Design a protein around this ligand. Sequence first.
Ligand SMILES: OC[C@H]1O[C@H](O[C@H]2[C@H](O)[C@@H](O)[C@H](OCCCCCCC3CCCCC3)O[C@@H]2CO)[C@H](O)[C@@H](O)[C@@H]1O
Ligand SMILES: *C(=O)c1cc2ccccn2c1N[C@@H](C(=O)O)[C@](C)(COC(=O)Cc1ccccc1)S(=O)O
Length: 265
Amino acid sequence: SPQPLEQIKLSESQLSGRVGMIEMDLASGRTLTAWRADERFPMMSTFKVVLCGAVLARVDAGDEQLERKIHYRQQDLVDYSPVSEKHLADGMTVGELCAAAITMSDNSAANLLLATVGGPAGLTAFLRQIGDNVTRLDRWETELNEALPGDARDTTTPASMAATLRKLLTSQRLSARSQRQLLQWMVDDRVAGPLIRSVLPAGWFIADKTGAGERGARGIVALLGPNNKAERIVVIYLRDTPASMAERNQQIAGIGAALIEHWQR
Ligand SMILES: OC[C@H]1O[C@H](O[C@H]2[C@H](O)[C@@H](O)[C@H](OCCCCCCC3CCCCC3)O[C@@H]2CO)[C@H](O)[C@@H](O)[C@@H]1O
Ligand SMILES: *C(=O)c1cc2ccccn2c1N[C@@H](C(=O)O)[C@](C)(COC(=O)Cc1ccccc1)S(=O)O
């Protein structure tokens, strides 16, 4: 594999799309690789990690409990509810809803949680409160995946998302337990995580949330490192490519391979 930046360029050439990327030390925030780091990309499902950060902040404040059972109706369900559709009779706890949102990409779980934090406006306010002045959520699932060209709704920048993830995971804004919970939810991805492990060399740590959208939008927020440590945050977004999902996946994997082969920088 070539150097990370050279691979990123190749990916734009092959895909005819825009790639946005940040590689950042998790402990310190040192930026290692930055490409289109200040350009806007749709968050898609990656917003769910921020959402559950906001939920945990409420838990820490005594305004929420992870144990609290939420009951909902079939009419509340939106497209793709693999966990939440199974609990119309018995409900789900707030913590279970965050697990379903993050580890199973359950859209109804995400919307139920979004309601608890004051909707898209509330989550945007939370972002402003932790010092992210760029990322914005405007819509609910699944409209937030629309990825219209030039539409600022429901977008982040790679630099903003990386900084925000680091804030939630490490800055002591969240309690120790809450930081640990948010990390464990990302470790526990039931879909991409296990497949990624199968193709990672031995010794590489992975935790992640993936996302997809219209017009080729695709992305991942990940923790990655050798020696079985979450050494770095890697944020990669793609937009405005006509390519197959398989090729978008391949290109993101290729950027990963470049990082792995050229890790010491
Ligand atoms: O010399 C370094 C390594 O080179 C190869 O490893 C390959 C591996 O066989 C391949 O499967 C992976 O693809 C990358 C797949 C990563 C999956 C997605 C990555 C995630 C991580 C967070 C951001 C991007 C998405 O690349 C590495 C590096 O070339 C060798 O197989 C391995 O023995 C050796 O230790
Ligand atoms: C966010 O999670 C999201 C947004 C969105 C829009 C349309 C369709 C699906 N979708 C998701 N979730 C999927 C995603 O692609 O991120 C999931 C998690 C499917 O995941 C994968 O396909 C990742 C993967 C790639 C290659 C190999 C193995 C796994 S969801 O549909 O289960």
